[PDB]
Amino acid sequence: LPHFSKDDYSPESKGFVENSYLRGLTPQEFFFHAMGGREGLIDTAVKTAETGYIQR
């Protein structure tokens, strides 16, 4: 993200969410979690199509 310096491999830089849902997420953690959820949804769609064809 443009909120981090270059070449930052620290856990918070590359998507570690140290806060719980009870505490709430910082904006960077919120975006990274959004990316993870997006990957999940995309995988769901692709998976259902492919598995339907394989099952047939």
């Binding site: 709430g24 997420l25 904006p27 959004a34 959820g37 997006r38 949804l41």
Partner: protein
């Protein structure tokens, strides 16, 4: 400490539908996506005329 800009507000990264969610940072992201999709199907008053 070498900043060149500052975010006006982080909550402005959300869109129109996601800006309705209360405490969106205390939710699992797919739930936010579901609510963003499902609020367009909410029943209200679309126009006063």
């Amino acid at each position: 400490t070498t900043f060149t800009h500052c975010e006006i507000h982080p909550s402005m990264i959300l869109g129109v539908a996601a800006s309705i969610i209360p405490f969106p940072d205390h939710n699992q992201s797919p739930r936010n996506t579901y609510q963003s999709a499902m609020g367009k199907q909410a029943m209200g008053v679309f126009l006063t005329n």
